[PDB]
Amino acid sequence: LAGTITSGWTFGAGPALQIPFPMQMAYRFNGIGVTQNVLYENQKLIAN
């Protein structure tokens, strides 16, 4: 849990590199075909 929260998927393929959690969520949103601005503009709703 700590690894997947503080470093995303990097810790599973080498050294663990830190990254802020909203930026990781933006990365994962890009993973499924949605742009970052959607998450950055609906962060509060998504967290709720």
Binding site: T35, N37, Y40, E41, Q43
Partner: peptide
């Protein structure tokens, strides 16, 4: 790429975005 304005995002930062076209136009 541009989207929206500078109040919705949390953690936005002042900086400058260079435009390649302007110096060519002025030259």
């Amino acid at each position: 790429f541009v989207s929206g304005n500078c109040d919705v995002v949390i953690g936005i930062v002042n900086n400058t975005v260079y435009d390649p076209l302007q110096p060519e136009l002025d030259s």
